[PDB]
Structure 1
Amino acid sequence: SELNEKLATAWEGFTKGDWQNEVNVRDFIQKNYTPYEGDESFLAGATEATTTLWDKVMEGVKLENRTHAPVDFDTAVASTITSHDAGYINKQLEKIVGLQTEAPLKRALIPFGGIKMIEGSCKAYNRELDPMIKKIFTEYRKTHNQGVFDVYTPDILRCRKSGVLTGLPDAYGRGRIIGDYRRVALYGIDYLMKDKLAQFTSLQADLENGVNLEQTIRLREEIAEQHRALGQMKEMAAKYGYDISGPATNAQEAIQWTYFGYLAAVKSQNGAAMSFGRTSTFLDVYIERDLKAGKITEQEAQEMVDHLVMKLRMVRFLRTPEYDELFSGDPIWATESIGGMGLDGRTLVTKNSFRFLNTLYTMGPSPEPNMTILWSEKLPLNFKKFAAKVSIDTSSLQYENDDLMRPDFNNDDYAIACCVSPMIVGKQMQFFGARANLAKTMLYAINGGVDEKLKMQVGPKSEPIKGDVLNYDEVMERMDHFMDWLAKQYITALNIIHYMHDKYSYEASLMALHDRDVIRTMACGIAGLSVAADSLSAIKYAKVKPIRDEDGLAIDFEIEGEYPQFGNNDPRVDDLAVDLVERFMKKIQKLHTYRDAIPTQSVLTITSNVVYGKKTGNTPDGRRAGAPFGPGANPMHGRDQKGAVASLTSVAKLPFAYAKDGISYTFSIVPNALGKDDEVRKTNLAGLMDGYFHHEASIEGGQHLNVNVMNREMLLDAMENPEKYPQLTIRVSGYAVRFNSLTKEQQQDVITRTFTQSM
């Protein structure tokens, strides 16, 4: 009798399945969603409530961009799931409700991660931290930040300072965790609490029998803290007049219930990336049903989605200036995975798939949510064209290869965390690790571990390369060794980091929405792949000569001849990049990791391409000192000159089999390069992607693609006239950003990047 009276009332009309007897969101979707292959013809426009609400919010957004600072934020309250009272923009107009604090865009204090960062923010934005809060989180409640720096080695500290291993999650929430928020809409809190209680009890035997004693005790307490979090979710909702103890009854509640789950998360955790998951299709099941019963109109459907997506555009977090340069544009990464194909061949695309992209029109361009299209050659052409259309009109979408990941996971319910990190919802998470500086690692190989800017020993002491002319084999050999060292220091830092985060900032509310046992990966990132690969190409195909100073340190390089650069579909250099990705992966792969997280790799950088760039001296490839690296796996600025097809082919060659955490690529192409009119552009854009993502047994294919369709001229104009593009949005590294939210220097990077002029 797993069919209570409300359960039955709430699920009235839903197809039966295991999902009614156990927690299985995937099954529910499979037995109930209705595939859609039509076009946008049905989409409705914004309601007056929507426009009124959004415009009010934009006023705060303009203030943020203009002042490059928070509109406001807490100074004396420690944020919790239940700490704040309900806040609204206009209670009489919102269909979906919920704010992190009591006021739109006001940022909170999440002290559990560390008190020093909060002080830094207070100082930077001219505000005073409440002395009691400071005392509590320095003497009574130890923070994640304190725990990490109490266990760090001086070597790691040197790497942090020199710029070889900087920006790791030791001063901000680790994130990279997506709780299955859909669960609360489907089952209700009470049902989920009973399920957790069962999970809790299932560990008693092992405990009593001393089986994995410490691991079992840890999991028990975690599940207990999870159970307690679910109860707080209810209290949180209650403050808003909602009772979410039971399952969602209609579309409106399905949306509200799911958002409420996410709200608890962004009210309690600092995560660099707090992704939404794969919810559009799921919610469509409730929308369809209400539509078919004539309980809701189509325009009322969009309104709800709009108000949901609107709240996602309002998620904010207090960050330090240091954080701002590591992750530019006030990012949040409220990622939504749309479309895709099921394992049974039908498309997961639905009307709600369109409703989501339509928020870009209904409310203009927006950086968040980070809407990600799970691409497949088998997608309904109607959808392929419309997505491309939205990309052409807004440059607010990103695409990931569903033909590649779906099979790799052999699951059709996986989502994208942050930029390109895949995970099966509710069953897997990542132990976030920013990225290491691969380029500086090569310089260390040439300078015997001495940093070229600080001139102090950082890497293992060893003899610097002597020749007057660099030689490929020799340089590769020393780099290989220095990469062993990097891998050991990197894993070591992450091991202590995730040990402390589990201890002082366990994300209870998010883990409560996962199975009892969750798969964990140790995601390691690589920055400057293209500067590293080219540098080698220069050395292996041209004559690179080091210019050394009085101490013999290589401070510059002269080049005689030309060499194949990455991104021009030239195996000579591309094979070198493919090789680097492979080496590093095979190295971090041999190290022991905390809680046995499976080491993984990603070619992602975020704004680390800028921070690592200015901390890295002249390199063999020719890049001058202080120059930004390329975003993610992108060729170095302007070096990919053989058009789109070429650059796309080079990147697609990068082995996702060794970069399971994702391979980011930002593609900027001028309007006319795609065609003379939108119909041609839509068709050509789609075509380009089908080729890039083309997955075959002997052709892995590309994994990700940001799509920017614009003219460099337009950006230059924006720089001069901010007030003219309040909502201008652009893809910059695997996520979107409002151009005006960037700094001068960061904009400088963007505008100097490659603007594909032809195919």
Structure 2
Amino acid sequence: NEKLATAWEGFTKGDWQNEVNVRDFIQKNYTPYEGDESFLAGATEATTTLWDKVMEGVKLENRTHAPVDFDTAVASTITSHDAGYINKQLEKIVGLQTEAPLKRALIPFGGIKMIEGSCKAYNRELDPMIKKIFTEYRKTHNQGVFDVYTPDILRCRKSGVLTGLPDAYGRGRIIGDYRRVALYGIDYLMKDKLAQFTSLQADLENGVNLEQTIRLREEIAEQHRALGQMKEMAAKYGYDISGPATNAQEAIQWTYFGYLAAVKSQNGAAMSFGRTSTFLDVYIERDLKAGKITEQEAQEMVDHLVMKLRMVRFLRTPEYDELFSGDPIWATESIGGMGLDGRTLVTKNSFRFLNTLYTMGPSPEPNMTILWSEKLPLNFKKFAAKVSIDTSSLQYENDDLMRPDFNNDDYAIACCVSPMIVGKQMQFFGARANLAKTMLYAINGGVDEKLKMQVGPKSEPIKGDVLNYDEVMERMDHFMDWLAKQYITALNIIHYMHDKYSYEASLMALHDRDVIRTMACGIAGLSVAADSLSAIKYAKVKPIRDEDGLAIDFEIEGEYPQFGNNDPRVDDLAVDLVERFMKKIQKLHTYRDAIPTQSVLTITSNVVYGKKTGNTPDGRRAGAPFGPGANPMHGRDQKGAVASLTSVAKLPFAYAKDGISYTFSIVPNALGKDDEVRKTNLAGLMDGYFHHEASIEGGQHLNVNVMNREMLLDAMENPEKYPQLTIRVSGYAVRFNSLTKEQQQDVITRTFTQSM
């Protein structure tokens, strides 16, 4: 075609010009960058003007810990709202979820109850019509799930053994390749989908997997229809995106537009952006070299785009707020990484993105993630580290581990640590299960230690004055079998219903015809679990039973090894647990045959599950929060950074393919006297942690907080002083002021590494 020729003028040819292959395009067009940050430009006046205006609303949010405003009588769709601006005269990249900045929408297909809850919470009246429609006419995801749930599953939800699963909010964990829009334009993609639709006809007529193929055909039709609405959406903003982006400003706008449709139609917990910085660099480079845009203009565009990612909002309930604290979005962007061909995927745009942290200050969103490799340009390693030291707003994932695992250099990170090959893979989100309570149950014969009711399988509680490790471990193993069963069953119900009542058409429309699905199960409280085993194994744990023989407390005699001090005695146990559970869920059948995977991730579930869990063998008191993700319990890792890093890296990514989250907080001085020593040290630390070999797997993820516990205490009292203070808390970042007093409590009481 000649339209494609004009737009792609200058680009190197390859398969990507005949089929949808974004990876290929990037491969033979991107310009690797090994230079430094000296070329970076600063914020333009419009950028600052716009951002400041927005910050006014962000202050209001943190202050009231409630949305700035939200819809009350409009059901959100890709085309439901009119164009919305901060200031149309200033914006270089446009597009808002609703007609106003930060005004949250109503995404009813997930369930009308959560919306009523939100309304009641923020003192607002849900429009009666909207309510009638989504209770009587359009059945929601929520309704379908609770119509099929078992009383067992409900008991678990209530007791805090299996709580917070995606049965009352968008499942998320899906990243459409929004780059496809910039590259090919809507029309081309629709024609491609039409072909995909037709490719299924044969199987249909021949009765081949009749029901599976009918479902897919309908899904594909919905995708095709979503694509067309994308155009209509863009059109409201005065844009025609039927053809491909012809320059940088459009590539960016076209890509964002793809994502915008997604966040206008689905309210998934995590609505990640993907791996786009390098892709977009191809269009920026071209415009720079042709002298069509300056460098400051390039940065301004990235700023306005990243600014919009800072404005993504979703109406949530209070229950949701404690499960996922900080008003998180997980507009995750995977930056850098190395190609399979040895070259670095780092580009000038890699820098421009991190630089938004300077042009517009620190921000928890987008959740910028560095795909780290020991072979990255040192120039970049240092800068990333500096930015971490400067803002504590970045996270790192082991690219030397994942790139070779997928044997693909175009995978991105969904939410926190869940990898997927862009446009070819997704996850069936499963939140996380309370592994700690599972142990207590094993000890108390399935009776919940707080509610004193039978939750797990009725069995005989462990007896004796002192706990025997082998016995406790066998009972626990049995209860894990039970946990796996309940957990997978719940997810099967959930994803069958989500596919039925809230299929993410606009996002799936930006994937291939056949998408790989994994059934991601999460494990919460891994450390309290492992330490508790250690206490029983390497010490004398004496259970204190109540009138009914229920173990409501434990007496410990003789110290024992704890997770995070690189002591194989505990560390081996944690690694064992990870293995055990993974091997168990692995046997169970799943919906759409999603391949079961595991992740040691918790988000704020460490606080919620901890709140609902009584005294444990490790010594943790009742109601105390577990450690975030795979972190050692608060303060138990006291042998320096390298010690704890080594422990967490011991955890097998081979049994936790959905990710292993580790939040690492270190005091400035522990990294050096000056920033030059700090950069080099931090980068060196990560090189060691992420070090990968055929013998040593290495760490998978790493949040990096560089600050003093004091600064936070100050922030707690002087909120208005650090409006943009950002911190990593569990695999994502949040503005410290967006947290609740109890959630801040969890933070300040966490481990602040003092040495190496």
In 2, Cα distance between equivalents of 1:337 and 1:168? 26
Structure 2 counterpart of 1:38:
35
In 2, Cα distance between equivalents of 1:339 and 1:534? 36
In 2, Cα distance between equivalents of 1:451 and 1:106? 41
Aligned to 1:325, the other structure's residue is in SS state helix
Structure 1 counterpart of 2:105:
108
Cα deviation, 1:373-396, whole Å, max 9, x if unaligned, reads 000000000000000000000000
Give the Å deviation of 1:320.
Answer: 0.1
Aligned to 1:188, the other structure's residue is in SS state helix
In 2, Cα distance between equivalents of 1:111 and 1:677? 52
Structure 1 counterpart of 2:215:
218
Cα deviation, 1:443-491, whole Å, max 9, x if unaligned, reads 0000000000000000000000011100000000000000000000000
Cα deviation, 1:117-148, whole Å, max 9, x if unaligned, reads 00000000000000000000000000000000
2:553 is aligned with 1:550: no
Cα deviation, 1:197-243, whole Å, max 9, x if unaligned, reads 00000000000000000000000000000000000000000000000
Aligned to 1:41, the other structure's residue is in SS state coil
Give the Å deviation of 1:58.
Answer: 0.2
In 1, Cα distance between equivalents of 2:637 and 2:203? 57
In 2, Cα distance between equivalents of 1:560 and 1:207? 67
Structure 1 counterpart of 2:163:
166
Give the Å deviation of 1:196.
Answer: 0.1
In 2, Cα distance between equivalents of 1:559 and 1:459? 26
In 2, Cα distance between equivalents of 1:671 and 1:292? 40
Q: How does 1:617-632 map to 2 (within 5 A)?
A: 617-632=614-629
In 1, Cα distance between equivalents of 2:555 and 2:542? 5
Give the Å deviation of 1:737.
Answer: 0.2
Cα deviation, 1:682-715, whole Å, max 9, x if unaligned, reads 0000000000000001000000000000000000
Cα deviation, 1:584-622, whole Å, max 9, x if unaligned, reads 000000000000000000000000000000100000000
Aligned to 1:616, the other structure's residue is in SS state coil
Aligned to 2:73, the other structure's residue is in SS state strand
Give the Å deviation of 1:525.
Answer: 0.1
In 1, Cα distance between equivalents of 2:676 and 2:222? 54
Cα deviation, 1:412-465, whole Å, max 9, x if unaligned, reads 000000000000000000000000000000000000000000000000000000
Give the Å deviation of 1:179.
Answer: 0.1
Aligned to 1:221, the other structure's residue is in SS state helix
In 2, Cα distance between equivalents of 1:19 and 1:209? 32
Cα deviation, 1:628-669, whole Å, max 9, x if unaligned, reads 000000000000000000000000000000000000000000
In 2, Cα distance between equivalents of 1:432 and 1:271? 10
Aligned to 2:334, the other structure's residue is in SS state strand
Give the Å deviation of 1:308.
Answer: 0.1
Aligned to 2:94, the other structure's residue is in SS state coil
In 1, Cα distance between equivalents of 2:129 and 2:218? 28
Give the Å deviation of 1:335.
Answer: 0.1
Give the Å deviation of 1:343.
Answer: 0.2
Aligned to 1:76, the other structure's residue is in SS state strand
In 1, Cα distance between equivalents of 2:376 and 2:717? 41
Aligned to 1:139, the other structure's residue is in SS state helix
Cα deviation, 1:18-39, whole Å, max 9, x if unaligned, reads 0000000000000100000000
In 1, Cα distance between equivalents of 2:501 and 2:134? 11
In 1, Cα distance between equivalents of 2:620 and 2:51? 44
Identify which of 497, 502, 526 aligns with 1:500. 497
Aligned to 1:534, the other structure's residue is in SS state helix
Aligned to 1:40, the other structure's residue is in SS state coil
Cα deviation, 1:64-122, whole Å, max 9, x if unaligned, reads 00000000000000000000000000000000000000000000000000000000000
In 2, Cα distance between equivalents of 1:529 and 1:308? 38
Cα deviation, 1:170-197, whole Å, max 9, x if unaligned, reads 0000000000000000000000000000
In 2, Cα distance between equivalents of 1:713 and 1:736? 19
Structure 1 counterpart of 2:743:
746
Cα deviation, 1:528-585, whole Å, max 9, x if unaligned, reads 0000000000000000000001100000000000000000000000000000000000
In 2, Cα distance between equivalents of 1:193 and 1:396? 38
Aligned to 2:597, the other structure's residue is in SS state strand
Give me the CA root mean square deviation.
Answer: 0.2
In 2, Cα distance between equivalents of 1:548 and 1:595? 45
Aligned to 2:28, the other structure's residue is in SS state helix
In 2, Cα distance between equivalents of 1:713 and 1:269? 39
Give the Å deviation of 1:757.
Answer: 0.4
Q: Identity percentage over the alignment?
A: 100
Identify which of 679, 684, 687 aligns with 2:681. 684
Cα deviation, 1:157-178, whole Å, max 9, x if unaligned, reads 0000000000000000000000
Structure 2 counterpart of 1:525:
522
Aligned to 1:32, the other structure's residue is in SS state coil
Cα deviation, 1:277-319, whole Å, max 9, x if unaligned, reads 0000000000000000000000000000000000000000000
Cα deviation, 1:344-369, whole Å, max 9, x if unaligned, reads 00000000000000000000000000
Give the Å deviation of 1:408.
Answer: 0.2
Cα deviation, 1:2-61, whole Å, max 9, x if unaligned, reads xx1110000000000000000000000001000000000000000000000000000000
TM-score (norm 1): 1.00
Give the Å deviation of 1:492.
Answer: 0.2
Structure 1 counterpart of 2:146:
149
In 1, Cα distance between equivalents of 2:611 and 2:354? 37
Identify which of 231, 235, 243 aligns with 2:232. 235
In 2, Cα distance between equivalents of 1:278 and 1:331? 19
Aligned to 2:534, the other structure's residue is in SS state helix
In 2, Cα distance between equivalents of 1:169 and 1:89? 32
Identify which of 628, 636, 640 aligns with 1:639. 636
In 2, Cα distance between equivalents of 1:566 and 1:677? 31
Aligned to 1:42, the other structure's residue is in SS state coil
In 2, Cα distance between equivalents of 1:579 and 1:412? 31
Unaligned runs of 5+ in 1: none
Aligned to 1:634, the other structure's residue is in SS state coil
Aligned to 1:526, the other structure's residue is in SS state strand
